Symmetry: D2
């Protein structure tokens, strides 16, 4: 019980890649046991368990599609069996689809709402009773600057992320007199596959295949620091929210965005 | 000579409450109006007559906004009867009060479907004509609950926050055009949606006393200690639809007696 | 007849720009108007005639809003000439562009004094009469720079943020009365305050090319790629002063071409 | 080996309350610390000893932050005793509760001077060294009152709103450097600044009952029904000063028991 989160059991959805893996790493570094998650029996990154287990805590991986409420429940029940009560829930799994509103596919709209907002509701609902019984909990929702402002061609995603922030506030208010907090982190751009795919698409469509020009234009359109936020930095924000100094941080956004929301 | 003369408006869920008040004010300002609700015969049998009193063309079309095909049928009906949809007011909406832990899955899905996704469907279906004609207004009826949270309203706060985010994106995609998209955020307004909540509170806490329950409900959130009216929400819709609001884009007009100010 | 018929309005700094545009729209809506600037002889010698074209009573009073005693003289003049101040528009404001490191101390103080503290002085002096009469409108001309920051505008963003916080408190202190207080937050409007900035940018970056400098200046911040007009800011003031805004309290009306939405 | 080892911090108004809590947390995290208040002999004779318990270099310098020449003296004292100022915490602040109508002109000016303008003076004096060194933290202690309004706190809400606006500008002017600027927004914390307000309420409304007044004061605004602690604010400052916060720029860290969430 030396490190700040020693003994706490965390679940990070969509932690085979990107921000989720970064968060899982930082939580383990801080002493938490961690359950990793994605859709596949074999993640594309075969080393994720080894990477997170390097910090001396207990780690598991469980394949579950967060768009299926029964699989969300399976992920929580597996954690309870393997490691113990879920004490830190990080709702992170998420997808993007870029399109003008007029031609935004109906199925893509529904999919983004299902994963990026409703899945967080399902998991939070499943975890809250145990947290209430134990008198402690953290629900950390990975929103976006796109939950606070709009961007062109991201209608479904901005809607889901705004919704996720509204959901965050309600959960925090319903738990405000308890040792359970609920907060959201709002990253600006982070160089993960979700962003790389977008930059590749505009590089081909607009910049003659020049990935450096496309990266600079994509980043600097929105982010005054003219640099990406890192997955380690988002993880550090998750560790902060999970720590005792954040016992009275409730229903808020921690924006880690290079200045995007400031202007 | 009226400020919206000749404009064709569609107001979803306009058989009752705020939607009907908006329709009334739009017609007072000279717009033709298509009213809408789920029923072949709305409960209020005089809604067409009440809105038609201001000398504009009025229609009613029954369509459930949770069904994309019926949203499309509403838009096509308007195009056929009155002409292109120029003012779209996404207003139909529902509430369900429950703690998060026991919030029914189907009730969450229903609230997201109507209070957020149906606005996406109707906006998607109306924007092409608006772009072709170079003018439009999309007015989304959000809530103070789209800006802050309240206990036992997780789905509704989520949907209304999401509706405001959607508003911003549509406004930005149209920012260099004659189309604007904005949201109105009312505080509490005394409609059946709120009356049913006050009844539940009166029965649980105040021995059925609606006078007492209404004041307790209102004063928990609304520093003016008075309700916002359907006419006031309609006046905000007229303002957003008028030429003075050509450069109001992607914003919230909050009409809430001070709720968000504190 | 007209919505503000007979109401007595004071618009500070209404010899130019947004203030004159607000005064014009308030007069068009039927209000009597007191115009105000620093000079006995405003640069624009025609302001009283331009505002008086709408058939209401118009006056001019020279007073520097940075001096509480001259604020009081303006209110007293209005009370003697036209009657009690019913609509107060706190609009006079200045700008100074500089990095924080070299921002002159006296310029910081001057911006705080005019763009924030003068609104407190005028509001304090007008509220007793509004309370005695059971009605009032205080309309504070803020900025998008009261909601977000921009480089090289530390004092102005501070003052305008402060003005928005002040607006909320005044609104909460009057929430159960017939007095409201709100702010309007324009984006860029083509006034001398902005033209001077565009001139500086042109010389620093665009070799004196006003057109190039004007498109760069706008499109850095304002997605509509067009200026907001003084008439549009005036129409927002009329809306806030009307009966449909009786329950709009402590809020911002953002008229900005999409700036705050992204 | 601790996360802020070797960094030199200055915390203004750190003889009491939140400022002392921040100083303690920064030192626990490895920072050298300069404490500050108005008095040659602070009321708490032990502040230096308490902060120095964590094995870092600690100093105290008496200076009134409303006087730009004394802000400069504090910075120059720090440079001489400990080295370049790397972490600046603008914390010193005062409160005055009064309705707007009777708010004393002098108390308004005093609150603006200390709660807003002093942060500008100290920031302006510290930035040049931070830019040369390529690293810095400016942490401004705002309030939930910088994000929303409360009755009878016009000057304070204005100043704290302005401080948040200033924070954004400084962060944008430094966004491509190793300097960040951010604000912490606490809800109610049980310091003398709050205890004096509760005593006023108790004597005015609860017949001297401090326990009743405390619960009413707290529960009107703060859904957690508990006070935030000076240690928690300090932990937020340590987080902002840490490497994980290198890309947190121009934002608010709100530590308020849910106040802004509703
Ligand atoms: N990158 C950025 O700039 C920003 C990202 N965010 C948010 O960060 C979060 C992570 O995104 P990021 O790391 O960027 O994107 P990545 O695509 O790198 O990671 C996405 C993660 O989600 C998992 N995943 C996808 N669909 C499902 C599903 N249906 N069920 C379970 N797991 C799933 C993937 O795992 P697998 O493929 O193994 O199933 C992967 O682990 C998202 O919520 C995103 O909105 C917020 C702000 C900025
Ligand atoms: N009342 C308040 O305090 C506030 C309300 N709002 C918003 O105002 C909007 C109107 O609500 P309000 O007037 O209060 O509530 P009402 O219940 O009074 O009106 C709801 C309207 O929606 C219609 N409706 C319901 N479901 C559907 C559907 N699936 N398809 C089409 N029409 C439908 C009803 O018509 P029928 O029954 O005839 O089908 C009725 O006309 C909602 O979006 C609500 O969220 C926002 C802030 C405050
Ligand atoms: N232009 C823009 O893009 C935006 C402007 N604003 C705000 O709009 C308001 C008006 O600015 P705008 O019209 O652009 O600026 P202008 O410079 O065009 O007008 C400024 C007005 O203030 C008057 N004035 C200046 N100092 C004083 C003083 N001490 N006492 C009394 N009157 C004074 C001037 O009158 P005289 O010289 O005759 O004394 C003039 O009428 C300001 O508060 C500004 O911050 C907000 C958002 C955008
Ligand atoms: N307490 C709360 O609930 C909240 C407080 N805050 C903010 O926290 C900060 C500290 O507040 P809090 O700790 O509560 O108040 P305290 O009154 O407990 O402490 C105030 C500190 O400021 C010092 N001080 C006062 N005037 C000056 C001056 N002119 N120059 C230098 N130092 C001065 C005092 O030291 P000395 O008397 O020795 O000079 C004391 O150290 C303030 O900015 C306040 O607005 C924000 C949110 C909530």
């Amino acid at each position: 019980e030396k490190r700040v989160l020693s003994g706490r059991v965390a679940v990070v959805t969509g932690s085979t890649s990107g921000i989720g893996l970064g968060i899982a790493m930082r939580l383990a570094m801080a002493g938490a046991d961690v359950v990793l998650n994605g859709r596949r029996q074999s993640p594309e990154d075969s080393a994720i368990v080894e990477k997170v287990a390097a910090y001396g805590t207990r780690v598991r991986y469980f394949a579950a599609n967060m768009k299926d409420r029964a699989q969300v429940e399976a992920l929580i029940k597996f954690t309870e069996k393997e490691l113990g009560a879920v004490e830190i829930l990080v709702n992170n799994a998420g997808i993007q689809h870029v399109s003008p509103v007029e031609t935004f596919p109906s199925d893509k709209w529904d999919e983004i709402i299902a994963l990026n907002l409703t899945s967080a509701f399902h998991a939070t609902q499943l975890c809250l009773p145990s947290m209430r019984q134990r008198g402690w909990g953290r629900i950390i929702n990975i929103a976006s600057v796109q939950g606070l402002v709009g961007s062109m061609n991201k209608s479904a995603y901005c809607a889901a992320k705004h919704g996720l922030i509204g959901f965050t506030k309600v959960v925090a208010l319903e738990t405000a007199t308890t040792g359970i907090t609920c907060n959201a982190i709002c990253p600006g751009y982070v160089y993960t596959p979700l962003v790389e795919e977008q930059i590749k698409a505009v590089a081909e469509a607009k910049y003659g295949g020049d990935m450096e020009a496309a990266t600079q234009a994509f980043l600097c359109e929105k982010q005054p620091a003219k640099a990406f936020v890192t997955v380690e930095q988002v993880g550090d924000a998750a560790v902060f929210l999970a720590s005792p100094g954040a016992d009275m941080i409730r229903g808020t956004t921690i924006t880690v965005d290079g200045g995007w929301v400031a202007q």
